[PDB]
Symmetry: C3
Subunit: 314 residues, 3 copies
Amino acid sequence: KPIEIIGAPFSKGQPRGGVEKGPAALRKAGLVEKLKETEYNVRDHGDLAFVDVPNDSPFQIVKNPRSVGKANEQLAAVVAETQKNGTISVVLGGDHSMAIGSISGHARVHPDLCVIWVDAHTDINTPLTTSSGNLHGQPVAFLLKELKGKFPDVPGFSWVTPCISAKDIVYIGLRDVDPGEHYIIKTLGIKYFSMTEVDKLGIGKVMEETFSYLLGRKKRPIHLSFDVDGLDPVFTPATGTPVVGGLSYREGLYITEEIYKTGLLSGLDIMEVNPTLGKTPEEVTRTVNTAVALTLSCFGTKREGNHKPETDYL
Amino acid sequence: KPIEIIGAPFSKGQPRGGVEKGPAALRKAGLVEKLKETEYNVRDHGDLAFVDVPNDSPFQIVKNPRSVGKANEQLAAVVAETQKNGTISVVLGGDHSMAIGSISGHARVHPDLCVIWVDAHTDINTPLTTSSGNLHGQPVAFLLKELKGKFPDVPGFSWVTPCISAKDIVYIGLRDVDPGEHYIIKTLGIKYFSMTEVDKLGIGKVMEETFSYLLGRKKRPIHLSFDVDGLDPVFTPATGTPVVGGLSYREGLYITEEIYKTGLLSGLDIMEVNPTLGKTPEEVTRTVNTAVALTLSCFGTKREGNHKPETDYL
Amino acid sequence: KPIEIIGAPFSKGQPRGGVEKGPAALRKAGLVEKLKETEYNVRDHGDLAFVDVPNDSPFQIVKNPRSVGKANEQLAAVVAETQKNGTISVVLGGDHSMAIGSISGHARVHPDLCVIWVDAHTDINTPLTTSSGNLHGQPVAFLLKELKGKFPDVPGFSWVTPCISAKDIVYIGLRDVDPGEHYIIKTLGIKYFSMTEVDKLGIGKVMEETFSYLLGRKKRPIHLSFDVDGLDPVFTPATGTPVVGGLSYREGLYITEEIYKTGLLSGLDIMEVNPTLGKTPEEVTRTVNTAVALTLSCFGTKREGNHKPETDYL
Ligand SMILES: N[C@@H](CC/C=C/[B-](O)(O)O)C(=O)O
Ligand SMILES: N[C@@H](CC/C=C/[B-](O)(O)O)C(=O)O
Ligand SMILES: N[C@@H](CC/C=C/[B-](O)(O)O)C(=O)O
Ligand SMILES: [Mn+2]
Ligand SMILES: [Mn+2]
Ligand SMILES: [Mn+2]
Ligand SMILES: [Mn+2]
Ligand SMILES: [Mn+2]
Ligand SMILES: [Mn+2]
């Protein structure tokens, strides 16, 4: 199977500068080389160059709408391309707002795909409900069909086409949801596993249920959008929005290991890694490393170990 | 539902000065204001003023018996009063010896109540078994009917009437129990979930079991006495008796969330928060915040989120 | 029951100097005195003096083969001796290569014993598969009957007799296995619980299954070889090969508590504690203390508490 790394050094989805250095950090840690050591063919597409939209006036409360909408239109193009020729796309974030382009592009080639969203936040604020005009917290709002026309069109997002419905997404790791967002998920019947369900069920049963919910009827492509803040700040401290009480390093890998086993992984997002937010070099190293680990886990690396077929080690 | 905060800045239950600053810290952190944001009506009763018993000679090995017995008689009066008015009492500790008056007052109004004791210590030492004469580790001893007459009457506690039996209490979080105390709980058949049972069962099944054990037959009022040292020192380091290998921030919240769901919470105790024992300001802030979070969780705050009824956010 | 502590200050099993200071550190922390406080009779045999093999040329890639083989021949003699007298042997590591002599000695007296191996590593590399010639990662290879003749005889190990088969061993805590080793355990059908099974099942079910697998048919003596690196680096940082995503302090004690309850503990190994690898004195103290705790847990110490029989504390 082919793998194609796509860097998206973008950061207008939110106020904190740094996330755009995410892809560099993950590469510097040997992500690409370590991936080659797996049974997958790897091709690094490089980092996309995003053209800055001059005079990008805020839309009501939404900030940098055009720059974000354009950077995402570009990314969607690229992702659709690699997806078209049957390769698995792996996007390296900047901020999670790039998930708009990532998933959009993916859905063009695979319209029946489902989304597993490992986050601490639902990122489903609509331009009307956001308290801050930060777009990294509104990705899903622009993707859901059920949210079509429930908020004014935003400058630069006209190209977007709601590709997935409320029945095709499942949240895992939730613990910091705004009143508005909570209203939305309850109202639309979205499936989720907040930290309370994780604590209650254990990470084993949670994964078991997310699959029977999304793959029960039809087996379809899987798009994993992983926000590094879904793990507890103790594991991934170098991010913009820390939230105590999150998934452990162990649980994170267990999610990625189970997803690898389904053989349906089609698209991946490793978002919000911000190298400039580490209080100590070690905090940044901790974060990058676990991000990398999760990525390799998605593509086979098992904790029980791995050995190359047909090779008699004795 | 009405909520009434009652401050109990008391500390003769133990040697370390500081716990009496507990209530101030919790208020300074915005506990009261944050509670008003919930669906509950909140009334701050203020801090009780405890009259110091001059010439409080120790009783055999028990220290400050009269000052502790008096402060607890006063608190019980106050708690019975608010309970009578049908409000939920929330006591802010000082040290855990105030649970004597808190639960006593509560039981006067609701004699059929049950006690969930989240601690690391059983606090069931009798005046005869204590190694130190500290009363904060003997609360339960003065409350259990089964321990009546098993120890000499103490100066200042004559007013106390054993209100609950061994079948009405369940311990969660245990990991530091004295030989005497362990003898007592084994002998009296007290239900408990030490860290081993939590590890073995998972916090979800532990809660499930504690409810069917205490509410299986009759649904009754619940009294949650929460000793902040029940969580691991990494979450609540500002306390007098830290003990490694404790409940996690996540588990703690899961206990409070499940208790909120029962709709039976009638009395709450947030004890042993000692602002002066933090090695760094951050340790104190860590402790106060998680204490505050547990309190709001007991009253509705969910990690999946909250939204106000009848409000169409779209 | 009698308990006999045997120090094995050895370190050619691996490159990092320091592990030989392991026994001293554990004693300095009061291990022996704390053990005497249990219901067990304790006898300290002292530290074995290992004679250095001059001109110990490496065997192909294997380092210090003769010094390691001799030190292990000596240890086995001593362990067989105490085992013969019906006492429980507790070996204090140096490096884990000493498990060769520890288990061998034990098996001489109890040929039907089983081995529970708490590690992050399988330590089952054969002289041919090792990437590094370090022996501390090949102990099990010299003990398995199924691996007899699958690798050239090594200088100084001729005295070794493969004592246990693939059906008598169970691994718990695995998360860093080499391709070769993974091939071996898969090919030989060895039972194991890597971190993914621990995450999926919970430490409670894991223990339940390890017993029904090794004690289902016949109840036999148990040999617990505990590599302190099996726990997460956050609990035992002072070791040569830390690996993130490991057993928690709680889980570790849960394993030792359940093993105590079986009443079948016959042999124990507390290995890889390296006092010189602690970044801060606290890291070393953290490590030694938890190592000591696990040891006392193996011999009765429970988190729910302990009290001496026949003593009426009231
Ligand atoms: N809820 C906040 C934060 C949302 C978080 C977005 B993130 O997960 O991408 O970091 C907002 O609505 O702006
Ligand atoms: N076991 C000690 C300590 C008891 C702990 C009481 B505390 O939980 O309120 O802090 C004693 O008996 O004095
Ligand atoms: N897999 C490495 C490391 C093995 C680890 C051994 B230890 O657990 O005793 O530390 C090697 O084969 O040398
Ligand atoms: Mn997030
Ligand atoms: Mn996000
Ligand atoms: Mn207490
Ligand atoms: Mn306590
Ligand atoms: Mn080892
Ligand atoms: Mn190891």
